[PDB]
Write a protein that binds this ligand. Sequence first.
Ligand SMILES: *SCCNC(=O)CCNC(=O)[C@H](O)C(C)(C)COP(=O)(O)OP(=O)(O)OC[C@H]1O[C@@H](n2cnc3c(N)ncnc32)[C@H](O)[C@@H]1OP(=O)(O)O
Ligand SMILES: [Mg+2]
Ligand SMILES: [Mg+2]
Ligand SMILES: [Mg+2]
Ligand SMILES: [Mg+2]
Length: 265
Amino acid sequence: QWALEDFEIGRPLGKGKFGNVYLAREKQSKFILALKVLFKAQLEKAGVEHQLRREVEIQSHLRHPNILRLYGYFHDATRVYLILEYAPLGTVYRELQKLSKFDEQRTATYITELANALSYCHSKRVIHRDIKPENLLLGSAGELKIADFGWSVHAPSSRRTTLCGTLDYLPPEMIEGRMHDEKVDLWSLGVLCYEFLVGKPPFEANTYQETYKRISRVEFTFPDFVTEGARDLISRLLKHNPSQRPMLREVLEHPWITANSSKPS
Ligand SMILES: *SCCNC(=O)CCNC(=O)[C@H](O)C(C)(C)COP(=O)(O)OP(=O)(O)OC[C@H]1O[C@@H](n2cnc3c(N)ncnc32)[C@H](O)[C@@H]1OP(=O)(O)O
Ligand SMILES: [Mg+2]
Ligand SMILES: [Mg+2]
Ligand SMILES: [Mg+2]
Ligand SMILES: [Mg+2]
């Protein structure tokens, strides 16, 4: 139903081994949006092909203000095209490299939007498993949207598929191939809260091996400027036992969150 013919392609929003994201405009309506264009070639010659199926099937059926919408898709036997809501203010990744760290009001707000978004996903038993600054996009009023559902599945789940990138955001159950569930995204949330305030993930190391160890041991420390309420929220989320991690309601209602945040639940 859609095809490339319907779009003008603008400036790239991301480039990589498998393809690119483009700013794009639909020709008949002038609707501006993003096109995530993957090379079939590389998805197959990599073993990611099934993930594109789940990314589309899951994201397309989610509707939430803090979830980046997927409007549709098409292909053309060289490439696949994901038709994405365009996020004008970029990534939290870029925001973080810009300001180095975030203040407590801004951190707590981003977390609230995250937990609201995950609340809705966990309602549909959908787990993201790839929550990280590169996949947090900023809407036109600066509000956070979760994007990139390549790693999302329905919970519970195992991991047959290979963990290719950094481990900084993944919980112990996931780096070890165990069965995992919604609590995966809660660990990630605490990683993010920490990174937002400190400027680097709480388990960053020089090697994948060292990083893996620090995650397995839950081995992180706070720089002295991190306050007691943040220390408390982070420590409660970064628990080895997934069952000990809170529910999202306890996060949205954490005192430090409600004090410093501006957005509601
Ligand atoms: S883990 C093995 C290492 N290599 C890989 O597997 C990565 C290969 N991937 C590719 O080459 C693909 O071409 C890309 C698109 C890079 C796949 O990356 P993602 O699956 O992570 O796709 P994202 O949806 O996360 O897009 C990545 C960057 O592009 C920008 N972007 C995406 N969508 C939007 C929207 N709607 N609006 C604005 N920007 C958008 C983001 O900036 C995103 O993160 P960056 O900060 O640019 O890195
Ligand atoms: Mg459209
Ligand atoms: Mg990504
Ligand atoms: Mg992906
Ligand atoms: Mg860094």
